[PDB]
Amino acid sequence: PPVKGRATRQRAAVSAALQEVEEFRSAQELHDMLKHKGDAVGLTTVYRTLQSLADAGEVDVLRTAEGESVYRRCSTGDHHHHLVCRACGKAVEVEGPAVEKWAEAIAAEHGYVNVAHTVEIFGTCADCAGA
Amino acid sequence: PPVKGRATRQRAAVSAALQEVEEFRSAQELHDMLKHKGDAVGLTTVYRTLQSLADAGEVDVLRTAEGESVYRRCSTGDHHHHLVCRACGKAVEVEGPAVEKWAEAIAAEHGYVNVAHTVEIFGTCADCAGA
Ligand SMILES: [Zn+2]
Ligand SMILES: [Zn+2]
Ligand SMILES: [Zn+2]
Ligand SMILES: [Zn+2]
Ligand SMILES: [Zn+2]
Ligand SMILES: [Zn+2]
């Protein structure tokens, strides 16, 4: 995830941390993990970096049930949706043109100019049910 | 909108105020308009009664983009999704089988035991362009 400004070891470290993992996580959790592995990087610094990255779109955002935003550097850059298990945190890249066509159709029927769909599916793995 | 608690003027007043308005609105906005109407009801009371109603399923919840929560009453008791114009705040309920079929297919393919899909979509309506 290249940054608009000059690259610095803090930005490189947070980028390495983002690409290191695949689950969704907030600024606090990634701050914890980077400090524990030996980065010593600021909370507001990582917050600003992920704000800039989300503005660039290199990472994907998701508001949890409480409300806090979690972030995930997704491999696929095209339009896509994520199936997320809260017990595991794993994200599966799922995309369907049917929902996009439905959104376009309902927007046209209602005469709406632009459509910005917010779709998320929350579930549990089969292993989660098993003990 | 019956409330699980005993019959009191607070619950009746907040339920009537919610019924009168047909726009997604935050707890603070509901408290302010209730105060202006002369109810003189507490903000914590508004929050508690609103949470009780949301747990009862008689009301529809939604999370704002910035983080706050808005709530609205829809006449239909059946499951439905919402199109909400951020510029005006007006919300309209629709239902399309395609999202349900896609969710079922994804759950079957990935083996997820149970899933909970949230589909709330946003777009500007015609009067926004009109001047
Ligand atoms: Zn992705
Ligand atoms: Zn999509
Ligand atoms: Zn799981
Ligand atoms: Zn509704
Ligand atoms: Zn509008
Ligand atoms: Zn649905």
Half-sphere exposure of A95 (CA within 13 A, CB side): 7
**Cα B86 to middle of ligand 5, angstroms:** 7
**Residue B80 backbone phi and psi in degrees, to 5:** -160, 165
User: Which of A92, A110, A125 faces B83 most closely, judged by CB atoms?
Assistant: A110
SS3 at position B103:
helix
Partners of A124 on chain B (C-beta within 8 Å) are 112-115
- Residues in the annotated binding site of B: 60, 74, 79-82, 85, 88, 93, 95, 100, 117, 125, 127-128
Q: How was this structure determined?
A: cryo-EM
Shortest CA gap A62–chain B (Å): 11
- Residues in the annotated binding site of B for Zn(2+): 60, 74, 79-82, 85, 88, 93, 95, 100, 117, 125, 127-128
Q: How many CB atoms lie within 10 A of CB B82?
A: 17
Q: Is B34 exposed, middle or buried (0-12, 13-18, 19+ CB in 10 A)?
A: buried
Between CA B80 and CA B84 the distance in angstroms is 13
Residue B53's closest CA among B17, B6, B4? B4
Residue B102's closest CA among A100, A62, A109, A110? A100
Q: Is B45 exposed, middle or buried (0-12, 13-18, 19+ CB in 10 A)?
A: middle
Please check whether residue B66 touches A, CB under 8 A. Answer: no
Q: Domain-by-domain residue ranges, chain A? A: 1-79, 80-131
A111 → chain B, closest CA residue: B126
DSSP lists the bridge partners of residue B115 as A123
Residue B119's closest CA among B60, B58, B32, B55? B60
> First CA to last CA across chain A, in angstroms?
38
Shortest CA gap B115–chain A (Å): 4
Give the type of residue at A122. F
Q: Are strands B25-26 and A116-123 parallel, antiparallel or unpaired?
A: unpaired
Best of A81, A102, A125 to disrupt the B interface by mutation (most B CBs within 10 Å)?
A102
Among the bound ligands, name the one nearest to the CA of residue B124. 5
**Residue B27 backbone phi and psi in degrees, to 5:** -65, -40
